[PDB]
Amino acid sequence: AAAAMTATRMPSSGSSPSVPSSIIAEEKLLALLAELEALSRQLAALTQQVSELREQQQQ
Amino acid sequence: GNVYAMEINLQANLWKSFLYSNVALYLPDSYKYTPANVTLPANTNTYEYM
After folding, report:
1. CA distance A25 to A37
2. How many CB pairs under 8 A join A and B?
3. Best residue of A19, A21, A22 to probe chain B, by most B CBs closer than 10 Å
4. Is A18 touching B (CB cutoff 8 A)?
5. CA distances (Å), B17 to each of A14, A23, A29, B11, B25, in order?
């Protein structure tokens, strides 16, 4: 009634960026698709000359 | 002899107290450093880091 009455008396907000580091970029990209063919070409050339041992030993 | 005493430059202390809190703490992050054995979050925009 008196004394104190003179003054006065959720779910999901879904953030995303959190506490990780900063990020950067560059545009000098992508030789790498050539080596996948270099590697599998030269791999064949190994077997090709293993065959050239065998095809001369068989003579 | 004279009474025992110690001496303080109060004015210089108040002026450094003004300068440090109002200007040194606001310098760009590149002027600051991290203490010898204190770890700060990697996110440089956090309060913990600042």
Report:
1. 27
2. 10
3. A19
4. yes
5. 42, 37, 53, 10, 11
